[PDB]
């Protein structure tokens, strides 16, 4: 297609509309109601251009560029005087009722409405009458509501309802009293409600957690990082000010998480700002806790570790690849233990074997949206891998997309698409121990124990391919529903099988692998997704090591007299009594961590590690993508006595002091080279980001914007002498604005989006090759493994049906987006959002116990009696008891275990 804008010829995509085609060319057209992920609706009337019939036409006609196709031989003008006057008039109409709020508005300096007001050149007010005002609502702890600032662009309702699937946000009212909010006060119920703060072009929906400690966008220090709160690896831009992590912005990655995060990743960052974190090395001597600097901490630790006979190291899936590798090098390969339990490790290694040996392509998160049928087995995706659930919602709406494409309706005309595809949708079959948040769009939901979910998967695989092992004892009605699933999956051009390790069942993963193999054998373009538990679960699985039970065995038998625990609380993966006994028996415990955990009371030495905000490293996605996170700020810039080093730096210098009695604060690139030299299946992590010598025409990449303020006053209360700018030897980023952040710079790591004239999140348009596409020079991150040439064999270990045995209670895992992740549930704003700990019971089991809804029952696990109030779960099955995983006292390792002595307290 060829378009002519203002007499200049451009070659565009004819399937695009004119607004996105012209924004992809670098032309500036103001817009409000259009979003690249939401489509065109033509509400705000801001994007007007002048379209001419042909080259020899001068009159023309004002058209909405978002609603106009970029067809071949199109003639438009943006800088036409009539078009400019109309766009300025639209801005003026929006300005008539807008409140005088910019100094006390959290959107200021980050506001799309401010940018478009300046861009149209409207700065003179001639409206003299009153302004309409609105009451605000309480939307919960995360989103602050300020309805006066609304321009009625309908982006919030289109995102929250049509895109995200939420039900409790809407538009109410009429002519000019349109109200965007909830029907009543209350917490917004969607797991993706936090994206409203970037979807809303004004300051109606604002980050309340940021608003408590507000600072402007130009005052932030940003870095490109990876969210640490689950395994999806969404790209984030954490920004800090005055030594504390202030905000998490979405960092655009066209391959992973393009515009959206979930609320856990957006709002669970508050554990970084906790005041009980270790900020200096501490050695316990007697009852005293002597504070050390880095040098003498390394010397004393090296002396005690040299005096010991065997040293073991316990890693964590929280820690990065470099940190776990450094611990593995310090203690030796045979003495290194993954910090997760044996069953967790077995399920994780099986998921890895399916991903990198099953011969079936594992999609990226953006690619999930293009699949034609989804089967989810055992994985409560919305509570464990939430952005996969959002992508699955888009994949389900793909059927309405196809039906509208059959009637020659353009891809961006979203309202016509939703009108054609009324309630038709692609098949979704979810399986869980209870109801999920995907049940509203699921074609079928199977609520069953994990044995029965695995049996359903094996039966589906056998019905698709008779070479798969058969299942004996399927009821005829369940068989009919299985046949419905098989007809939906066999007719799909791109079926997608999603499972994961959060079900606590190996057989569920085996059944999902069998279904994916059966669909692969029929010629389908099948994909398989595995949801792991933690940010670097897949990296820890690739690195390998013994289980936590083997490490505790070594500590309890006395074969190991020194243990180094890296970023692991050890109570989420084993019983707390056994961990406490093993750590009390060991004469040397050294905890390298950034959070105050319960095992530090047994620790002889505590090394104050850095969090993701204060460290660099590599983490491995649930799809096997290696991604770097870069340090946001120097922790010692404000508090000079803070000794908070990276975990790989601590462990590498400790290894160097153990060998040659000299400390060695290494560089990140050296550790990455060591990883790719010693572990060949982690060799892809070298290409995740360029090394520290990378430059854009000789200069580094800036962490903070050009207008960063307070350079000679922010530390002036400590000392009037401005300190040295902190030097970053690990990465290509600088701790200053003396660097490059151009949208046209040849790089993939973008710390934050800013363009002149574009201060809002809409500045990401300048950083993309096409708007809503990829980044201009490729998205960051690299897949570690390719699709295998040959797949696996069928798993023949079909489990038996679940049998409720008296006295025992199978623990059904219930996951929560706010509470199940360890560090995020340590964040203070999650405590208001955290549900009360309820033990979930079947009505029949509660009637057998005599227990009603709300009475407190006591149950003993590992000889420890704990008491919880009862919530009746109708979707649960008899003989199972539902427990909230990862909460206070309930470890996620309890999933699949049995329970004893359940009685009323």
């Amino acid at each position: 297609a060829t378009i002519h804008v203002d007499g200049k010829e451009y070659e565009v995509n004819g399937a695009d509309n004119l607004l996105e085609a012209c924004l992809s060319l670098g032309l500036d057209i103001p817009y409000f109601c259009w979003h690249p992920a939401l489509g065109s609706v033509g509400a705000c009337r801001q994007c007007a251009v002048k379209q001419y019939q042909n080259a020899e036409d001068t009159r023309g006609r004002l058209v909405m560029s978002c609603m106009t196709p970029a067809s071949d031989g199109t003639f438009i003008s943006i800088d036409d005087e009539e078009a400019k006057q109309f766009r300025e008039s639209v801005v003026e109409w929006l300005m008539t009722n807008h409140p005088h709020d910019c100094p006390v508005c959290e959107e200021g300096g980050n506001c799309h409405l401010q940018d478009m007001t300046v861009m149209t050149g409207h700065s003179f007010r001639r409206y003299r009458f009153t302004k309409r005002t609105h009451r605000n609502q309480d939307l919960g702890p995360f989103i602050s509501h300020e309805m006066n600032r609304c321009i009625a662009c309908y982006r919030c309702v289109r995102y929250y309802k049509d895109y995200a699937g939420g039900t409790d946000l809407g538009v109410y009212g009429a002519h000019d009293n349109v109200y965007f909010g909830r029907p009543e006060d209350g917490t917004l119920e969607s797991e993706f409600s936090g994206n409203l703060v970037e979807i809303c072009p004004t300051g109606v929906f604002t980050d309340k957690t940021h608003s408590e400690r507000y600072n402007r966008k130009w005052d932030m220090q940003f870095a490109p990082s990876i969210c640490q709160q689950c395994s999806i690896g969404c790209n984030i831009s954490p920004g800090e000010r005055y030594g504390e992590l202030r905000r998490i912005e979405n960092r655009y990655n066209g391959t992973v998480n393009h515009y959206f995060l979930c609320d856990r990743g957006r709002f669970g960052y508050g554990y970084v700002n906790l005041k009980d974190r270790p900020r200096q090395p501490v050695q316990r001597r007697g009852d005293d806790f002597i504070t050390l600097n880095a040098e003498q901490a390394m010397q004393g630790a090296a002396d005690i570790l040299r005096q010991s006979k065997k040293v073991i190291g316990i890693g964590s899936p929280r820690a990065s690849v470099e940190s776990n590798f450094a611990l593995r090098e310090l203690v030796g390969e045979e003495n290194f233990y993954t910090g997760i339990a044996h069953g967790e490790q077995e399920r994780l290694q099986l998921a890895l074997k399916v991903l990198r040996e099953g011969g079936i392509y594992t999609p990226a998160l953006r690619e999930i949206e293009s699949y034609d049928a989804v089967l989810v087995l055992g994985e409560d995706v919305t509570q464990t891998g939430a952005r996969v659930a959002l992508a699955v919602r888009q994949a389900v709406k793909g059927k309405a997309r196809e039906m509208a494409a059959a009637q020659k309706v353009a891809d961006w005309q979203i309202a016509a698409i939703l009108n054609i595809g009324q309630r038709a949708k692609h098949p979704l079959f979810v399986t869980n121990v209870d109801d999920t948040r995907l049940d509203d769009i699921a074609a079928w939901t199977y609520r069953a124990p994990v044995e029965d979910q695995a049996r359903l998967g094996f039966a589906i695989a056998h019905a698709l391919d008779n070479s798969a092992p058969a299942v004996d004892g399927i009821e005829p009605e369940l068989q009919s529903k299985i046949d419905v699933i098989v007809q939906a999956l066999a007719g799909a051009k791109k079926p997608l099988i999603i499972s994961g390790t959060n079900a606590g069942s190996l057989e569920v993963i085996q059944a999902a692998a069998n279904v994916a193999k059966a669909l692969k054998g029929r010629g389908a373009d099948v994909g398989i997704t595995m949801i792991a538990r933690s940010v670097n679960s897949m990296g820890l699985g690739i690195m390998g090591g013994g289980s936590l039970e083997e490490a505790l065995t070594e500590l309890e038998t006395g074969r190991a007299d020194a243990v180094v625990v890296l970023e692991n609380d050890l109570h989420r993966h084993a019983s707390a009594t056994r961990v406490n006994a093993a750590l009390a028996k060991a004469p040397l415990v050294m905890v390298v961590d950034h959070q105050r955990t319960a095992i530090m009371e047994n620790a002889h030495l505590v090394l104050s590690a850095a969090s993701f905000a204060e460290s660099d490293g590599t983490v491995i996605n649930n799809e096997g993508r290696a991604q770097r996170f870069f340090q946001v700020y120097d922790p010692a810039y404000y508090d000079s006595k803070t000794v908070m080093l990276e975990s790989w730096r601590w462990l590498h210098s400790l290894h160097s002091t153990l060998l040659s009695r000299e400390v060695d604060w290494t560089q990140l690139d050296h550790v990455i080279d060591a990883v790719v030299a010693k572990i060949p299946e982690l060799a892809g992590i070298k290409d995740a980001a360029p090394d520290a010598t990378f430059r854009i025409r000789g200069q580094k990449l800036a962490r903070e914007p050009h207008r960063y303020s307070g350079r000679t006053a922010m530390r002036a209360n400590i000392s009037v002498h401005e300190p040295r700018q902190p030097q970053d030897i690990d990465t290509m980023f600088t701790f200053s604005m003396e660097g490059n952040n151009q949208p046209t710079a040849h790089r993939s790591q973008v710390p934050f989006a800013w363009a002149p004239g574009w201060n809002s999140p809409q500045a990401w348009n300048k950083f993309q090759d096409e708007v809503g596409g990829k980044l201009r020079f490729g998205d960051p991150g690299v897949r570690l493994f390719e699709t295998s040439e040959n797949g696996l064999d069928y798993f023949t270990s079909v489990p038996a049906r679940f049998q409720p045995q008296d006295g025992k209670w199978r623990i059904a895992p219930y996951y929560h987006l706010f509470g199940s992740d360890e560090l995020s549930q340590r964040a203070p704003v999650f405590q208001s959002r955290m549900p009360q700990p309820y033990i979930k019971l079947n009505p029949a089991d509660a009637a057998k116990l005599g227990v009603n809804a709300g009475t407190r029952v006591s149950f003993s696990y590992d000889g420890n009696t704990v008491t919880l109030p009862v919530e009746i779960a109708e979707g649960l099955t008899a003989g199972q008891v539902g427990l909230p995983m990862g909460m206070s006292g309930i470890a996620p390792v309890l999933a699949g275990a049995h329970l004893e002595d359940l009685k009323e307290a």
Partner: protein
């Protein structure tokens, strides 16, 4: 009455055509008269109009093909099919075929509605049918087709 007389419902007049007719009472918005907003209000939604194309003929009520016509058009149809094309074309010597309900309202002698052929001048409507302005009133303006 038309249902109990066999004119509506299943197998009308023995042809085999099934047609069911419903009456949907609105809840009072002027924008509901706009045909795409009418379709939105029929679907139980807020009566925002829809952008065209696509027109309701291809994707209308609940995505199905839908045709929206005024009361007077559908009242013109039965006489057309009961008398013929040439009768409907031979009642007015104008480019607009057929008759139309026209009438003057507001401070006139006889406000009301009369069926007149197209091409009738407004002055003769006001003076003959409406009777002209009332006593002691001077005509200064008029609107031909509503607000």
């Amino acid at each position: 009455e038309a249902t109990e007389a066999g004119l509506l419902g299943k197998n009308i007049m023995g042809t085999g055509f099934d047609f069911e007719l419903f009456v949907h009472t609105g809840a009072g918005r002027y924008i509901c008269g706009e045909e795409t907003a009418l379709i939105n209000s029929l679907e139980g939604r807020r009566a925002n109009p829809r952008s065209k194309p696509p027109f309701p003929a291809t994707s209308g009520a609940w995505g199905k093909p839908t045709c929206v016509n005024n009361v007077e058009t559908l009242c013109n149809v039965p006489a057309i099919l009961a008398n013929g094309v040439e009768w409907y074309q031979n009642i007015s010597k104008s480019k607009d075929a057929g008759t139309k309900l026209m009438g003057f309202s507001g401070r006139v002698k006889n406000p009301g509605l009369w069926e007149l052929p197209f091409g009738t001048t407004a002055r003769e409507i006001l003076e003959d049918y409406a009777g002209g302005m009332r006593d002691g009133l001077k005509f200064k303006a008029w609107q031909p087709g509503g607000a």
